[PDB]
RNA sequence: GGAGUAUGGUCGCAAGGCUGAAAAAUUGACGGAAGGGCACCACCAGGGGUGGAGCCUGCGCGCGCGCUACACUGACAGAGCCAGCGAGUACUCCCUUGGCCGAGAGGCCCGGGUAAACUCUGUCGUGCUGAGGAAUCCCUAGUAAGCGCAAGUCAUCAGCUUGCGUUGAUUACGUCCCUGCCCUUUGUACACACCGCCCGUCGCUACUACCGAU
């Protein structure tokens, strides 16, 4: 997916499906968001066609990739030669032979290539205390800062 | 409907689960460990 | 044990970064960073829980010395524009009696 | 639910509190306020009783009577 | 006043984490007592702790009184239990509508010594201090959705515990046209709980039964119409009211009155209503992994 | 203590002393003849006296300051006034303790809050 | 009135639930219905069955009350619901059937 | 080796179909008439929804719960004046024509689609430029309505939900006469004081005698 807006606990996703039919087979599931959230797809959202509302644990940042785990059951095919080397017989060539042979490039994804990082060194903001705390608490642990 | 079913399916698989596990745990500890320890009186006999 | 492993069985995996459509929104908090933030929100909102249950377990008639020798943060009723709850202090400096700065105007 | 309903009426027994007497304590008897060795065992409650007469006034007139 | 109150809460709280340190010595104590009255070995440590044989010939007795559940342990609620008729008030969100006033008027008839307010624009807090001002037992918060209910708190004072519960399936009274239901029988009703097992259940258990005005001890069986009945499977506590007429000692035959909750709590907060500095003695918790599985209750 | 366990009256001496004394404010718990064994004290009594529950309270900073301003009277106590320091405070009126008609601690902590109103 | 108090007058007009009649009222009851009339008793009052707009009409029309049962179609949507996702649960991958034309 | 504490294996009993779905009771059963208390599921006074048009969640094309439109309650212009919730290295309305610099993945640049209110002063003068029936339901002091600004609390809630501040009224605030509901006619502490054995149909228990078969 892709976060549009993020409220604290909860939060909207954009780019993730197109319709809310899908959202409603996609009811009540489960939805882990790269870092570590587990969290839950709860309704549909109405206006934006695409739109998602779901529940996690901490705010989801801005710049997160909201992912849904999905098991999609598969198939092999049903083709078949038997060799008959004492006939001749075709083979179905490699692959890497045939991209060598039309000249069709081994596709890849610029984004899926691994890569280092260059992180920053990670502070904080300083500690906040709101006003009201600031002119009710007790004396002894009054704040001073000139 | 599809999540209370799927839900069911995961508890009553799980309670089998672990009590399959528990039982040729305990079995086979038991048996090995048996003949282990008459192993043990018979070599300490000497 | 930990001769039971291979070479290629240790050799282990390497982050996935971000995606190069996107980049202008911020790096991607992978499991560390998500630690990080959390207890450093943690323990702030741990701090903010304590005050509250000092402030809302005050008791209004305290005494102390202090309150005959600091400013009082007061609100904004007193204060005005200018005021957070702080109680402030000195900066430093106080009134400098007149002697003393004509001897300062003197060596200036 | 109709049915267990049912049978908890049918047997009934309820969970629910009842009303206690009020001062169950001192009054554990209750009649009305109206018209109407062991022995070691029972001197020694007498005195015991007194001891906690003279630790009462004692007590509650040492605290100024707010108790 | 608000000193007193906020003294004793804090008083209340000392005096439990003393029974948490005075009950992890006391399960070793009373090792003791029953192996005095059946002569069977113990622990020679348990045996060789003096303080604890010292102790123990001061202190048998009041664990005699608990075996034999003559005593009232100590909490929220029984200090005085069977003696104030529990005052209960309800009062919805900011600004309710017509369904929802109506639903809470109903559960105000549904609890029978409940008075009803409405809110207004009025302050949580300052609500909080005016109940407590009138000395109250109770209050609720019933939210909504859309003309529906939402979330019941049953919370109790002085200082106890706020059940917030989000409730599910409920429909109401006022859509049965006033022809076929009727005014609603207002009696002292009893009370079943169909399920409760853990101490976490017996303990929701309790603040549900101090709702209800103490039925006069001599004839609970035989009088009294009106029965509510609290039962759950699936973590779900889930209530019908039902007055009965009895026509034999074999049939009793029900009526449906009050309305249908499927309630499930997901909060138990140790700390009344507003109080964001709270105690959290239990929640629904969801999101880890096997807490969507296995129960509570 | 030496009354036997099965005694009635004898559990009924327990809850009177534990709660006389829990309502007193000595004691901690209402529930162990132990601590009424080894638990009562003399600086339990001290701990009740006058000045040092309004140091806990947090009239004064210590007791000095706290002895003293009994002393020289500033401390009502519900309705009463205050002279003798060693006017035993239950728990029930370690709570109506405060300070008197109109005197300048009063002021000193109302000066300071800034709600200093001279009426 | 009350559901209580309507309730047992009309049991009481059944008959059920009176005073201990005699035996020469019950040889009376003998000498001169009540299933059926209690199946629509026991209908008219667990009425939390079902779901009714308590207006009536909008506009009273005369041309010659239940407008639904959400229980029933709770429970009629969990059958089809089982009899038709539940197999295909089970039979996800499961591959030959029988074709029968006749 | 002793003591417990568990875990599952082993054995005995429970594990033999006069069968075939649909009371107890000296206290028990149901009523009625007098006497009080109560109630916005009652009267009396008033208000205000929804129900008209549309949007639309939810509940079973129907439905209510919200939201919006509807003209003197006018517009437009200036001037003047006050709040409460509010702070996680955190929050963005899209998606696209061109061009820039990028052998390529992009980044730029330009376009296309710290209230509301109030008060004062003037400029105009009703103009497809019409405030929701029967029905019903709610409500008695910071109660009703109107207004906004914020937060988005695991559960429910953005088609919204929840907070909190602002302006703050009429009309009752009596009464058990309607409808009711509860409970008195037992028991439950004694004074000076007052009252003065409700009623019904039966049941059940003891006794009396009867009737007639065998």
């Given at each position: 997916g892709t976060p549009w807006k993020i409220f604290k606990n909860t939060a909207f996703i954009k780019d993730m499906f197109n319709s809310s039919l899908e959202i409603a087979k996609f009811e009540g599931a489960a939805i882990r968001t790269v870092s570590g959230i587990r969290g839950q797809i709860k309704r549909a959202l109405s206006k934006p066609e695409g739109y998602f509302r779901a529940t996690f644990e901490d705010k989801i940042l801005l710049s997160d990739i909201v992912i849904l785990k999905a098991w999609y059951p598969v198939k092999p095919k049903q083709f078949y030669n038997p060799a008959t080397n004492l006939i001749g017989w075709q083979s179905m060539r490699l692959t890497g032979e045939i991209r060598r042979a039309e000249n069709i490039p081994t596709p890849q994804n610029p984004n899926s290539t691994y890569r280092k990082i260059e992180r920053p060194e990670r502070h904080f903001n300083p500690l906040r205390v709101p006003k009201n705390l600031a002119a009710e608490l007790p004396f002894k642990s009054q704040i001073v800062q000139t | 409907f599809i999540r209370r079913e799927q839900l069911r399916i995961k508890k009553e698989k799980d309670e089998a689960y672990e009590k399959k596990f528990k039982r040729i745990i305990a079995e086979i500890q038991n048996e090995e460990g048996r003949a282990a320890n008459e192993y043990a009186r018979e070599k300490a006999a000497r | 044990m930990s001769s039971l492993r291979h070479a290629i069985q240790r050799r282990a995996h390497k982050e996935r970064a971000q995606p190069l459509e996107r980049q202008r929104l911020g790096i991607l908090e992978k499991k560390k960073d998500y630690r990080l933030r959390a207890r450093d929100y943690k323990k702030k909102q741990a701090v903010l829980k304590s005050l509250r249950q000092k402030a809302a377990e005050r008791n209004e008639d305290e005494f102390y010395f202090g309150m005959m020798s600091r400013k009082g943060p007061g609100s904004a009723l007193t204060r005005?524009?200018?005021?957070?709850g702080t109680v402030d202090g000195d900066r430093g400096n106080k009134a400098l009696s007149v002697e003393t700065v004509r001897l300062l105007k003197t060596q200036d | 639910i109709e049915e267990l309903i049912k049978r908890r009426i049918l047997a009934g027994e309820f969970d629910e509190v009842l009303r206690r007497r009020p001062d169950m304590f001192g009054n554990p008897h209750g009649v009305r306020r109206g018209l109407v060795a062991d022995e070691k065992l029972r001197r020694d409650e007498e005195e015991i009783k007194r001891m906690w007469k003279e630790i009462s006034a004692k007590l509650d007139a040492l605290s100024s009577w707010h108790y | 006043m608000l000193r007193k109150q906020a003294r004793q809460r804090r008083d209340y709280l000392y005096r439990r984490a003393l029974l948490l340190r005075d009950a992890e010595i006391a399960e070793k104590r009373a090792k003791l007592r029953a192996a005095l009255a059946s002569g069977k070995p113990l622990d020679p440590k348990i045996a060789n702790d003096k303080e604890l044989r010292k102790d123990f010939d001061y202190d048998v007795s009041r664990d005699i009184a608990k075996e034999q559940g003559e005593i009232d342990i100590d909490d929220?609620?029984?200090?005085?239990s069977g003696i104030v008729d529990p005052r209960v008030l309800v009062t919805t969100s900011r600004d309710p509508s017509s369904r929802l006033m109506a639903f809470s008027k109903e559960i105000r008839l549904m609890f029978p010594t409940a008075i009803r307010l409405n809110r207004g624009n009025l302050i949580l807090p300052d609500l909080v201090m005016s109940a407590q001002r009138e000395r109250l037992s109770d209050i609720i918060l019933l939210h909504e959705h859309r003309g529906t209910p939402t979330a019941i708190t049953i919370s109790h004072f002085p200082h106890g515990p706020t059940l917030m519960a989000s409730l599910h399936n409920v429909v109401l009274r006022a859509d049965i046209p006033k022809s076929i239901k009727?005014?609603?029988?207002?009696s002292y009703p009893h009370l079943i709980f169909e399920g409760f097992r853990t101490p976490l259940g017996q303990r929701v258990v309790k603040i549900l039964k101090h709702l209800f005005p103490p039925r006069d001890p001599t004839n609970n069986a035989k009088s009294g119409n009106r029965v509510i009945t609290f039962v759950n499977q699936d973590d779900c506590i889930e209530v019908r009211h039902h007055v009965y007429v009895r026509t034999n000692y074999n049939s009793v035959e029900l009526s449906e009155v009050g309305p249908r909750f499927t309630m499930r709590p997901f909060s138990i907060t140790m700390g009344t209503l507003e109080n964001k500095d709270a105690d959290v003695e239990w929640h629904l918790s969801?999101?880890?992994?096997?807490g969507r599985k296995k129960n509570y209750f | 203590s030496l009354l036997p366990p099965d005694n009635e009256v004898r559990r009924k001496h327990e809850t009177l002393l534990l709660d006389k004394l829990y309502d007193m404010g000595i004691l901690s718990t209402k529930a162990k003849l132990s601590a009424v064994e080894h638990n009562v004290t003399v600086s339990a009594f001290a701990r009740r006296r006058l000045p040092v529950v309004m140091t806990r309270l947090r009239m004064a900073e210590t007791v000095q300051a706290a002895t003293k301003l009994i002393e020289q009277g500033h401390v009502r106590v519900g309705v009463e006034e205050v002279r003798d320091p060693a006017f035993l405070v239950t728990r029930n009126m370690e709570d109506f303790v405060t300070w008197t008609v109109g005197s300048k601690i009063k002021q000193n902590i109302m000066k300071y809050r800034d709600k200093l109103d001279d009426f | 009135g009350s559901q209580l108090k309507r309730l047992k007058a009309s049991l009481r007009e059944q008959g059920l639930i009176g005073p201990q009649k005699s035996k020469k009222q019950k040889r009376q009851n003998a000498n001169d219905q009540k299933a059926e009339a209690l199946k629509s008793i026991r209908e008219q009052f667990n009425p939390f069955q079902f779901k009714t707009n308590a207006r009536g009409p909008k506009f009273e029309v005369t041309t010659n009350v239940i407008k639904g049962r959400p229980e029933l179609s709770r429970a009629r949507s969990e059958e089809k619901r089982r009899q038709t996702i539940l197999v295909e649960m089970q039979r996800r991958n499961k591959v030959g059937g029988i074709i029968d034309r006749r």
């Open positions: - | - | 005005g524009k200018g005021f957070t | - | 929220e609620y029984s200090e005085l009727g005014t609603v029988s207002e969801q999101y880890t992994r096997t | - | -």
